[PDB]
Design an enzyme around this catalytic site. Structure first.
Site, PDB file in Angstrom:
ATOM      1  N   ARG A 141       0.771  -1.507   0.211  1.00  0.00           N
ATOM      2  CA  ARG A 141       0.252   0.092   0.210  1.00  0.00           C
ATOM      3  C   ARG A 141       0.448   1.458   0.033  1.00  0.00           C
ATOM      4  N   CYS A 181      -1.832   4.801  10.157  1.00  0.00           N
ATOM      5  CA  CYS A 181      -2.813   4.038   9.097  1.00  0.00           C
ATOM      6  C   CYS A 181      -4.401   4.209   9.099  1.00  0.00           C
ATOM      7  CB  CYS A 181      -2.062   3.455   9.540  1.00  0.00           C
ATOM      8  SG  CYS A 181      -2.677   1.556   8.808  1.00  0.00           S
TER       9      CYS A 181
END
Length: 306
Positions: free
Chosen positions: A200, A259
């Site tokens: 990611r 996150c």
């Protein structure tokens, strides 16, 4: 804050001054759909363990796991029995996934005397407790509905409520003073970290709300989830010290984590307190995520794809 082992916890338990909280919020994906905490919590738990509704505590928020107010929090933990100087302990049925969010949360509100259980699965493989001794392999659990909780008195009251440990989305878009990455001292000014996977970032990978982008925001030493965890728990203090210093991760400047939802970005506060690379009053955390940095931020901030 600190952590402990499952073995010392049996000794720490026998006196009801250690208020235990369970935190096992699962992701809202179609896989775990039909795998709840509250429905599994009231079937198997630890003798004194309590639930915290991260979905109901922070009810008013776009990002659902936002940090709630100090007065939708105090006036529910009085309903849970904890006091201002009551030590507390945390465990998650999933390994190290959803626990430290609550620890960071307590740290926001001047609550020291907080610790997190390293390995759950080893607690499952205990023989028993000094109390409840005649019952071997039971007593570790409490397979019954949670009953009558006499409310706290005197009530919880946060003295400090230090908020500098959290940063607004403005506080992270305010890297605009120097927006050329590490070349602009993003690696010298604020050592960002992202708990997003290496897939990611350093490119592009499917986000959870897969309509916006995915990558590695400006000037962020990326340290990922399994890089400290090994199948049930954290690594050695020297293990984490080496995991960071082997990279450029060093507590020399301001440091902030990232996150999805912040629900696992606090792991990269806990491991840091474990190693010591920074300071408990400084190693801040950005509860906003890439979900904020892509949905409510500019178009040039995003990192490159393949």
């Amino acid at each position: 804050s600190k952590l402990i082992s499952p073995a010392e916890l049996a000794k720490r338990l026998s006196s009801k001054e250690t208020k235990i909280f369970d935190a096992t919020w699962y992701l809202p994906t179609p896989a775990n759909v039909g795998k709840n905490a509250y429905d599994n919590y009231m079937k198997k738990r630890i003798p004194g363990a309590l639930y915290f509704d991260i979905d109901a505590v922070n009810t008013p928020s776009k990002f659902p796991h936002m940090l709630p107010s100090p007065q939708t929090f105090e006036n529910e933990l009085t309903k849970l029995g904890v006091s201002s100087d009551s030590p507390i302990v945390v465990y998650d049925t999933q390994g190290v996934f959803s626990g430290p969010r609550l620890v960071w949360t307590f740290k926001v509100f001047g609550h020291d005397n907080v610790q997190f259980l390293n390995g759950f699965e080893a607690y499952t493989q205990l023989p028993g407790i000094p109390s409840r001794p005649d019952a071997y392999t039971w007593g570790i659990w409490d397979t019954q509905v949670p009953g009558k909780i006499d409310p706290a008195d005197p009530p919880y009251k946060v003295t400090k409520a230090r908020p500098e440990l959290v940063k607004s989305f403005e506080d992270v878009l305010a890297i605009v003073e120097k927006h050329n990455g590490d070349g602009a001292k993003i690696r010298n000014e604020v050592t960002f970290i992202d708990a997003r996977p290496n897939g990611r970032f350093t490119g592009k990978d499917a986000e959870p709300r897969a309509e916006l982008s995915s990558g590695h925001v400006p000037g962020a030493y990326s340290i990922a989830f399994p890089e400290v965890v090994e199948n049930g728990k954290f690594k050695s203090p020297e293990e984490l010290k080496a995991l960071f210093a082997s990279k450029g991760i060093d507590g020399s400047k301001p440091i902030i984590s990232m996150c999805g939802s912040g629900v696992t970005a606090c792991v990269i506060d806990l491991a840091l307190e474990i190693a010591g690379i920074g300071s408990r009053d400084t190693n801040a955390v950005y509860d906003g995520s890439w979900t904020e940095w892509a949905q409510r931020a500019p178009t040039k901030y995003i990192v490159k794809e393949e």
